[PDB]
Design a protein around this ligand. Structure first.
Ligand SMILES: *[C@@H]1O[C@H](CO)[C@@H](O[C@@H]2O[C@H](CO)[C@@H](O[C@@H]3O[C@H](CO[C@H]4O[C@H](CO)[C@@H](O)[C@H](O)[C@@H]4O)[C@@H](O)[C@H](O[C@H]4O[C@H](CO)[C@@H](O)[C@H](O)[C@@H]4O)[C@@H]3O)[C@H](O)[C@H]2NC(C)=O)[C@H](O)[C@H]1NC(C)=O
Ligand SMILES: *[C@@H]1O[C@H](CO)[C@@H](O[C@@H]2O[C@H](CO)[C@@H](O)[C@H](O)[C@H]2NC(C)=O)[C@H](O)[C@H]1NC(C)=O
Ligand SMILES: *[C@@H]1O[C@H](CO)[C@@H](O[C@@H]2O[C@H](CO)[C@@H](O)[C@H](O)[C@H]2NC(C)=O)[C@H](O)[C@H]1NC(C)=O
Ligand SMILES: *[C@@H]1O[C@H](CO)[C@@H](O[C@@H]2O[C@H](CO)[C@@H](O)[C@H](O)[C@H]2NC(C)=O)[C@H](O)[C@H]1NC(C)=O
Ligand code: NAG
Ligand code: NAG
Ligand code: NAG
Ligand code: NAG
Ligand code: NAG
Ligand code: NAG
Ligand code: NAG
Ligand code: NAG
Ligand code: NAG
Ligand code: NAG
Ligand code: NAG
Ligand code: NAG
Ligand code: NAG
Ligand code: NAG
Ligand code: NAG
Ligand code: NAG
Ligand code: NAG
Ligand code: NAG
Ligand code: NAG
Ligand code: NAG
Ligand code: NAG
Lengths: 118, 123, 440, 123, 123
């Protein structure tokens, strides 16, 4: 699998974030562990959350959870992150990643990431 | 006592499951006939226990599962089934679907096991 | 790093010995194998499974043998005992209208027999084959009198073989080898799992095997140790050879009462000039299917050697002849007319036969049975589907080897059909490492 | 069907464990031999169930325990075992350690029960 | 070894319950007598397992319940019972109450199931 991040890096303090990642090599609908992580000078790596591509359910970092949602559109093998109450503190490099963790196997796939300034 | 609830409604009769459960275990020619009978009682007991284990139910008289109820098996109310019907009537009502339901119960448990192979929470 | 994870229901097995039961679709076989068989039984092909088979160590053969012996002993259990007939007989030769081929074969005997009342006797006259009667010192006795009691087989009980399917009990499985050229020993790559074997017809015979399955591609020669002269050779043909057997005279069956509720059957009289029993095989067919065997033998012994066939070496009638049950009668045919050729790189063959009623079955001493006579003229047609051959010892010599019809155990007749089946036990537990740990 | 997974890799084969379990519980001399066969089928079934009980895996087809894997029992990649090997091959590879592993599983469960006598919530 | 704990105190003896569990499972007239014995051993095993099922203790060697201990069954110090008595002595002391206690354990489990059927996640 190959992961490519996208979306605008120029965000006003009054609007939302919308980042859509492309997935190539497998389907979103057949897997789990699709997730977002961000990197900022104040915090090396902060998990955001992941989505189950088979069931559509999600899990979020409790500290971010109150303002964040993750969803998919499997017809184009894409998924996205949306944050509503976006502020200066949310400036970070955002990454698209695939986390595979099962009894018989472990691996990650990371995209190159994008930068967002608020 | 044993089968005392046979004429009771399903709801009322579900409270006597234990007494029924407890009554399942309790001249060459004659001796063979009796061994035949004892072995079979054991085999039947074990088959029911195995099915419950396969379906994910073990050590329970009442066990819930994830298989949806089909209106095609029986289109009735909860109040109708539990308050105005006995288990004998119910057993006849859906005897046509016994194997269908059992097949589905097994499939549901197998999916559950597959989901448990993930270390990821799957949320 | 990794922890043990326990799995139950793991698809593995090991070689095992168990008890099989039979199933089938007044016949002894049908009475015993009372369990029905499935229409359209299914089998499961096991893709990518290589398994090792050994027909010479197969215990399905041993069980089949043991169960067959039991059926015979149980079937004869309630039948009339003939102890009262072990008396001095006065016998003369039948010389009336007897051809030369049969001269001396029949003895016309008489004796003072009991009736249902203990104080009365009757004079009984009957015909016997010489093979059943021996001279005392003319005065004769039945041949079994100095060894054991004899039981009359019940005339209403049929031993005619029917297909029998052997089935495994729960917890066990039967693996079948489908490789086309499989010779009974070693790895097999096309295998499948079945619950029951195909039907096997339990025909009991000696030198030639009758009404079995055929090889599909060529004649297949199977042996435990091909260069060992102490081992037999089982040859499975890919074409059947038809053999037509008969007892040409019209025999008349008579009966007397021996005791309360107990009747004895005997041949009263034979109508017509007396002629010998015999079996025919097409000569051309027999020669063609012998040449096919020779070609396969050359593969093991060399295509520059000489393969000769010869008759049996000697021994008891039950060993040296081709024995079979035709219409319920017991025939012992001379195969020297078949195994007489040398192979170097229309008409029928007639085999004369002899018939006897006192039979020591299954190579046992005592426990004899008397085969009741059969009314009328007997005819049957059978398929030769294989042979049991032995090599005549030897050494390099002049590199000519001789194959003779073998004697053989009755087990060899079952080994030839069960060669593709193996019984294994299922073992559901196993462990393997994974990344999980007890949750708490 | 039954044993259709025999040639499958361990990973794939483990997807269908129920089919291999549900197929385990299906003239005087003949009658005795048949009774003996039925009794053994039951005794073997129960023996295996008892071990799962002792090891703390009762009612499960797949059970995770705390006994660590020893590199001396087998040293292969986790992916090598689950993807490039069948259960028949594996069983032969480690048949030498079967009893050792079973002994350890029992000891582990005994320690777990001792830990449960703690009442300090086991930390 | 098996029954080696027979002279031990109840506390110490309870450390080795598995050894006592693993030792429970293993001419026409002779054959029938042996089948008699084997079938019976199985029936006893299953009978005890069924009770553990009924009482809600399936799959465990040690199980906590909700039935209070009665001073009328046996009035001794907790430390007296566990440190100064063997299991044989204990069994004799309360043999008269065996059925009473078993009856209460059954009622307790039935009430627990009734509470589970409530769905307000409160006893
Ligand atoms: C190798 O395989 C062949 C083929 O299966 C066997 O040949 C058969 O052998 C049996 C037993 O000897 C024969 O059965 C007898 O059939 C008689 C009727 O024959 C006519 O009707 C049939 C109808 O199917 C025609 O095919 C046939 O040509 C005739 O027109 C019955 O009358 C016999 O009854 C006897 O037993 C009963 C028992 O209840 C008594 O009441 C009777 O009075 C009588 O004694 C009997 O059923 C069968 O017909 C043979 N088939 C063929 C095609 O010939 C070989 O025997 C077998 N080889 C070996 C070594 O086993
Ligand atoms: C003896 O051999 C003959 C063939 O030479 C067998 O008869 C054939 O059996 C096949 C079975 O698939 C049929 O398709 C053919 O139509 C049959 N041929 C004829 C001419 O009928 C016969 O069944 C064999 N006998 C025994 C007892 O096995
Ligand atoms: C075996 O073959 C012989 C011939 O070799 C058969 O005997 C002949 O039968 C015909 C009638 O069909 C008579 O006209 C001949 O005279 C007979 N020949 C001899 C030498 O007697 C015999 O019937 C065949 N037997 C079987 C069982 O097929
Ligand atoms: C065994 O007997 C059968 C008959 O039951 C013989 O078969 C017949 O042979 C004649 C030629 O003589 C043909 O015209 C018939 O069509 C054949 N009938 C059948 C049903 O096949 C057979 O040849 C005899 N076999 C031997 C070895 O003698
Ligand atoms: C039979 O029906 C009556 C209806 O009034 C009910 O009160 C009674 O409990 C029922 N009998 C049983 C065994 O449930
Ligand atoms: C079960 O529900 C499905 C829809 O999910 C329906 O197609 C089917 O006919 C129902 N009943 C049976 C017996 O199949
Ligand atoms: C299915 O139900 C019909 C009545 O609607 C009944 O006649 C039939 O025998 C039933 N089939 C089975 C397998 O129970
Ligand atoms: C009967 O046959 C035997 C064969 O050995 C012969 O010795 C004897 O003389 C014959 N008896 C009569 C009366 O022909
Ligand atoms: C039968 O008994 C008579 C005397 O009643 C005797 O003369 C005769 O020889 C005996 N016959 C046989 C065959 O034993
Ligand atoms: C019975 O008599 C025959 C013929 O004389 C002889 O060959 C056989 O050995 C004898 N059997 C016994 C047990 O003596
Ligand atoms: C196994 O069966 C297939 C047909 O399904 C055939 O092509 C292959 O040659 C067979 N293998 C052997 C060893 O006979
Ligand atoms: C044939 O028999 C030999 C032993 O004589 C054995 O090594 C070989 O595996 C067997 N099978 C085949 C198909 O040759
Ligand atoms: C038997 O095998 C030979 C091999 O040379 C072949 O010519 C013949 O046609 C085969 N017969 C049958 C019925 O397959
Ligand atoms: C085959 O037979 C020969 C005797 O000629 C013997 O030396 C050899 O060891 C036998 N083969 C096997 C595998 O036993
Ligand atoms: C004869 O034997 C030789 C080995 O010496 C073998 O190569 C050849 O294929 C065999 N068959 C024929 C027809 O030559
Ligand atoms: C084998 O044939 C010879 C004649 O070549 C004959 O003397 C011998 O008795 C025959 N063998 C048997 C067992 O009949
Ligand atoms: C078989 O036939 C030959 C013909 O030469 C004869 O010499 C031999 O004694 C016969 N053997 C048997 C057992 O009938
Ligand atoms: C064997 O064949 C020869 C002719 O080559 C013949 O003279 C002899 O009688 C035959 N043997 C038998 C037992 O028929
Ligand atoms: C078999 O028949 C052929 C003719 O097709 C003949 O040349 C051959 O010699 C015969 N077989 C024997 C053993 O004589
Ligand atoms: C046999 O190996 C092939 C390899 O491509 C695999 O696709 C197939 O599923 C395997 N068979 C089984 C039963 O796993
Ligand atoms: C298991 O691991 C221990 C170290 O913890 C080691 O000493 C031992 O040899 C290993 N293998 C076996 C079979 O005990
Ligand atoms: C240990 O493994 C080797 C190699 O597979 C085998 O030869 C040996 O018999 C095994 N020992 C035991 C006790 O299983
Ligand atoms: C027997 O009693 C003594 C008392 O000091 C104790 O130390 C010992 O362990 C007891 N034996 C057993 C088996 O518990
Ligand atoms: C159990 O305790 C109650 C008091 O709470 C008492 O009435 C009852 O008799 C006791 N049980 C027995 C068996 O004595
Ligand atoms: C009650 O227990 C005492 C021992 O404390 C015993 O002597 C008495 O016999 C028991 N009661 C009955 C009815 O067995």
């Amino acid at each position: 699998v190959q992961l490519v991040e996208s979306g605008p890096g120029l965000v006003r303090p009054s609007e939302t974030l919308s980042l859509t990642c492309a997935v190539s090599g497998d389907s979103i609908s057949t897997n789990n562990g699709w997730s977002w992580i961000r990197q900022t000078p104040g915090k090396g790596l902060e998990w955001i959350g992941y989505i189950n591509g088979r069931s559509g359910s999600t899990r979020y970092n409790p500290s971010l959870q109150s303002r964040v949602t993750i969803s998919t559109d499997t017809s184009g093998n894409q998924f996205s992150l949306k944050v509503n109450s976006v502020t200066a503190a949310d400036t970070a490099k955002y990454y698209c990643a695939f986390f595979w963790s099962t009894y018989y196997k472990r691996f990650d796939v990371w995209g190159p990431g994008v930068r967002v300034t608020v | 006592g044993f089968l005392g609830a046979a004429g009771s409604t399903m709801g009322a009769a579900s409270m006597t499951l234990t007494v029924q459960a407890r009554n399942l275990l309790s001249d060459t020619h004659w001796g063979i006939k009796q061994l035949q009978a004892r072995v079979l009682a054991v085999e039947h007991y074990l088959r029911d226990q195995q099915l419950l284990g396969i379906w994910g139910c073990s050590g329970k008289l009442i066990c819930c599962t994830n298989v949806p109820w089909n209106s095609s098996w029986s289109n009735r109310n909860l109040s109708e089934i539990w308050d105005n019907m006995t288990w004998l009537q119910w057993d006849k009502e859906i005897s046509n679907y016994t194997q269908i339901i059992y097949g589905l119960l097994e499939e549901s448990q197998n999916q559950q096991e597959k989901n448990e192979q993930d270390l990821l929470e799957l949320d | 790093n990794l922890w043990v994870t326990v799995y139950y229901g793991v698809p593995v097995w090991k070689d095992a010995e168990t008890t099989l039961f039979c199933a089938s679709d007044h016949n002894v076989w049908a009475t015993h194998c009372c369990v029905p068989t499935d229409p359209n039984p299914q089998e499961i092909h096991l893709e990518n499974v290589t398994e090792e088979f050994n027909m010479w160590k197969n215990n399905m053969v041993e069980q089949m043998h043991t169960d067959i012996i039991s059926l015979w002993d149980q079937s004869l259990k309630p039948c009339v005992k003939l102890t009262p007939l072990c008396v001095t007989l006065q016998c003369t030769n039948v010389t009336n209208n007897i051809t030369d081929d049969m001269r001396g074969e029949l003895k016309n005997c008489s004796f003072n027999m009991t009736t249902e009342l203990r104080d009365k006797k009757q004079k009984v006259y009957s015909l016997f084959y010489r093979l059943d009667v021996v001279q005392i010192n003319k005065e004769y006795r039945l041949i079994n009198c100095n060894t054991s009691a004899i039981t009359q087989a019940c005339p209403k009980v049929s031993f005619e073989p029917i297909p029998i399917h052997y089935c495994a009990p729960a917890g066990f499985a039967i693996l079948k080898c489908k490789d086309k050229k499989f010779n009974g020993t070693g790895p097999c790559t096309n295998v499948s799992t079945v619950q029951c074997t195909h039907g096997i017809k339990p025909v009991v015979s000696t030198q030639l095997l009758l009404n079995g399955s055929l090889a599909e591609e060529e004649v297949i020669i199977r042996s435990e140790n091909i260069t060992n002269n102490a081992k037999n050779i089982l040859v499975q043909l890919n074409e059947s050879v038809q053999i037509n057997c008969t007892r040409p005279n019209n025999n008349t069956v008579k009966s007397i009462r021996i005791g309360p509720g107990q009747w004895f059957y005997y041949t009263g009289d034979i109508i017509g000039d007396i002629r010998q029993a015999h079996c025919n095989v097409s000569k051309a067919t027999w020669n063609e299917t012998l040449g096919k065997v020779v070609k396969q033998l050359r593969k093991h012994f060399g295509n520059n050697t000489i393969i000769r066939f010869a008759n049996s070496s000697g021994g008891d009638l039950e060993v040296t002849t081709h024995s079979f049950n035709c219409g319920g009668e017991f025939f012992y045919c001379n195969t020297s007319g078949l195994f007489n050729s040398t192979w170097i790189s229309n008409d029928s063959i007639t085999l004369p036969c002899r018939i006897k009623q006192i039979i020591n079955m299954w190579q046992r001493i005592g426990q004899a049975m008397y085969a009741p006579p059969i009314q009328g003229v007997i005819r049957c047609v059978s398929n030769i589907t294989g042979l049991i051959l032995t090599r005549d010892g030897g050494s390099t010599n002049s590199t000519t080897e001789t194959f003779r019809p073998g004697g053989g155990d009755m087990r060899d007749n079952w080994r030839s059909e069960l060669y593709k089946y193996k019984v294994v036990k299922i073992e559901p537990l196993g462990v393997a490492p994974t990344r999980c740990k007890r949750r708490v």
